[PDB]
Amino acid sequence: DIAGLTPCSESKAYAKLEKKELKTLEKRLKQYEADSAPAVALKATMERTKARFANYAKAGLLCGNDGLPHLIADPGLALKYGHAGEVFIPTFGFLYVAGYIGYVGRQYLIAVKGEAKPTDKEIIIDVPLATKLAWQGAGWPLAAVQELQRGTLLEKEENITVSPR
Amino acid sequence: KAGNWLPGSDAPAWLPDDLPGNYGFDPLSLGKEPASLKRFTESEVIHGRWAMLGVAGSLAVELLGYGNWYDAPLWAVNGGKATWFGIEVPFDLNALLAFEFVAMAAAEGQRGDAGGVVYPGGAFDPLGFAKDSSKSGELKLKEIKNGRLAMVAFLGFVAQHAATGKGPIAALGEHLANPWGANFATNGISVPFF
């Protein structure tokens, strides 16, 4: 559709690749008796291969002349043409998890900083406190906005060290 | 102050209450510096005065059945002849460009040297309206408000044309004929997913 690509569902190269892959697995399945554990394993890989080629096509992925799925990363083209589960949604999923890790770690460092030996709490992890922050990190995005709006997220330049210039 | 753009908000301190057309609207704080505000005050009035002439002209041509403001200059790129109120104009693009350049260079040049003079008066106020101070405030407000509305109208004239290709009067006609079926939300350009 976009970029002159073609649905994997209608690509002939996509179909030939699936046959090529299953024919390698079948050429090997022969040297073994039907119930032999080797045979069972090659069969389960063949079933997994058939499901992948079918699942990828059903997801409406586009395929290039190579017969391989290409991912659409433009938010505009992805939303208008049904390709948002390829890069857009993954982006907000990762950003949530990555911010989760960052906000929890920042909250931990801030908590241990007011202790007697912060350095000790960095080599020996205060597990109970760490677990508490780990659970409270689900609402980090709203907490990060509320900190950004109170002006408590950043540090005053006057309190940050710098070189002579 | 003329009023408040956002009821219950605080008007910026840099905007003088005497400034004609002050509604406290400077959310970008673009006029926080006094010299910048002085230029912006002259440019709003100038832009408004051109816009008002433009919108009046854009409407007249179509209302008098001479075409729309957009198709006005096509005669030059169609190898035709200039027309005004029907009368054919003897000059051509070359002559128009030269006459205008000289005319605009002279006038604007004369005004530029005079400085930020926004309200010249004298030869420019022959019937003597803004001679006093009492009439002045209201008359300058009416000028700035009508200029702001015309600037917005002209913008509308361009945006609507770019999306529909119709003249302002022709678009009014379609909206009046089918109000809910003929608007920006039905164009297919203003809101892509609508």
Partner: protein, 217 residues
């Protein structure tokens, strides 16, 4: 002190007298979202608007649905009603939404500015004499005035009870809408059918037997 979990430690930010003045305060903020007072005030406004919208919408899905189930009505299922209504409307959906955003944005902006500075919308000369009524009350999120035509908020001996019923009925209607969405995706039927089907065989007709909610069992 009523507690969402008897014996649990109530957050100190929900035990503060101002927080206790809030309706529906059962000490529930396990994620600590309202520790900051200024945020707690915004979230209280947000909870009130969600409660009042969910109550109106859920009433507009259940009440018509039960009446249709009886016969007094022939309303389409909530998830099919948009298509049915737009089918014979005077306007396409896009035009109807554009008009909605304009009218909602205007009244939403006035409510917003009232949160930023309570009483600001009474700015004299701002609304052809109506600004006087546009000033709310001493309690944010409870405008009263024209919004309380029968003056029920004027009875101080009943004020607290009325607000608790609004918050509890609102929290229930918010969960009833989430239930309507989840049940639609897991059943392919409407909330009134889901109710009748379960009541016929509750031990074999439930989310444990829907083949979606519990993909492990």
């Amino acid at each position: 002190r009523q507690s969402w979990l008897p014996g649990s430690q109530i957050p100190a930010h929900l035990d503060t007298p101002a927080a206790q003045a809030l309706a529906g305060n059962f000490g529930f903020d396990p994620l600590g979202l309202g520790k900051d007072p200024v945020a707690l005030r915004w979230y209280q406004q947000a909870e009130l608007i969600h409660c009042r919208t969910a109550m109106a919408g859920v009433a507009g899905i259940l009440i018509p649905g039960l009446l249709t189930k009886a016969g007094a009505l022939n309303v389409p299922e909530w998830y099919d009603a948009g298509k049915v209504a737009i089918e014979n409307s005077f306007a396409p959906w896009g035009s109807l939404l554009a008009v909605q955003l304009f009218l909602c944005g205007f009244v939403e902006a006035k409510r917003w500015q009232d949160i930023r500075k309570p009483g600001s919308q009474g700015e004299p000369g701002s609304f052809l004499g109506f600004e006087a009524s546009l000033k709310g009350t001493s309690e944010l999120g409870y405008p009263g005035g024209p919004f309380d035509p029968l003056g029920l908020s004027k009875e101080a001996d009943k004020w607290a009870d009325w607000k608790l019923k609004e918050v509890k009925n609102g929290r229930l209607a918010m969960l009833a809408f989430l239930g309507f969405v989840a049940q639609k995706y897991a059943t392919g039927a409407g909330p009134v059918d889901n109710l009748a089907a379960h009541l016929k065989d509750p031990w074999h007709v439930n989310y444990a037997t829907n083949g979606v909610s519990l993909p492990f069992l």
